[PDB]
């Protein structure tokens, strides 16, 4: 199906002494494959998926150089932004950046992204056309003008439409055994009585990949949202994901209720009932 490569960068200033804490992570779809942490002893980009360990020393040297350059850019920005917003030296502040590319089922370019935030709020982002900028406020407007004069969007468009997709396709091939494999959810239902008159049915989906999933309840064949609870999709810790959805029902009426599961790894949606 569709695939993506994304890089996420976070820098957090450290008032009082030294440089910011900087953490960078790379993902293909829902699989982390590289990391850099400024607090770690190696000071190298490090592998986080077995299929990236195929890359030679030139790759690791190059990624380390680039990621360190990224960290210095954020260091400078934190200083610049503190001044733009008239903030004191006493507080910790945060810059976050995300960029990457999406490809369709044919592995050709679909969409590119490059977004930046200061203290958890939008600052500047590349528009969908990869040609212009969305600036949230007047500080970001000054940045927009600087970046327009320096043709930053042109540089990013070249990476996002070219290099990003080329390397995504390489990773998809090299990690085919996992990255191109869908893991269908393993489903079951649990029952609990809260009192003599009320019961909870919980529909579970476990061990699935990718993370995208829909779990819904129906009653007598029609959608039920009232008296339901849906937890956020969560990582199992082994590369797969988990989710559940629950419904409160009158004791004795369990058979009216069906749970419906949709996932890429299922050719047709699944139905569960309390047996």
């Amino acid at each position: 199906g569709s695939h993506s490569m994304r890089y996420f960068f976070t820098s957090v200033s450290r008032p009082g002494r030294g440089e910011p804490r900087f953490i960078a992570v790379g993902y293909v779809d829902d699989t982390q494959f590289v990391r850099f942490d400024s607090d770690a002893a190696s000071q190298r980009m490090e592998p986080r998926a077995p299929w990236i360990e195929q890359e030679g020393p030139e790759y690791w040297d190059g990624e380390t150089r680039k990621v360190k350059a990224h960290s210095q850019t954020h260091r400078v920005d934190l200083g610049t932004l503190r001044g733009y917003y008239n903030q004191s030296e006493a507080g910790s502040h945060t810059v976050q950046r995300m960029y990457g590319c999406d490809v369709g089922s044919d592995w050709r370019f679909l969409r590119g992204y490059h977004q930046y935030a200061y203290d958890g709020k939008d600052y500047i982002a590349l528009k969908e056309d990869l040609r212009s900028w969305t600036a949230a406020d007047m500080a970001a407007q000054t940045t927009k003008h600087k970046w327009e004069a320096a043709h930053v969007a042109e540089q990013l468009r070249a990476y996002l439409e070219g290099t990003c997709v080329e390397w995504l396709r390489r990773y998809l091939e090299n990690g085919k055994e996992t990255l191109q494999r869908t893991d269908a959810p393993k489903t079951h239902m649990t029952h609990h009585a809260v009192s003599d008159h009320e019961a909870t049915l919980r529909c579970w989906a476990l061990s699935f990949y990718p993370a995208e999933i829909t779990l819904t309840w129906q009653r007598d064949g029609e959608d039920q949202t009232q008296d339901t609870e849906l937890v956020e999709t969560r990582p199992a810790g082994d590369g797969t994901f988990q989710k559940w959805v629950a419904v409160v029902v009158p004791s004795g009426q369990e058979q009216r209720y069906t749970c419906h599961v949709q996932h890429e790894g299922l050719p047709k949606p699944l139905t569960l009932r309390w047996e």
Binding site: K66, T73, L81, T143, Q155, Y159, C164
Partner: peptide, 10 residues
């Protein structure tokens, strides 16, 4: 692979 260019100060 990281972008080599386009990561410039704000």
């Amino acid at each position: 692979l990281l972008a080599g260019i386009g990561t410039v100060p704000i």
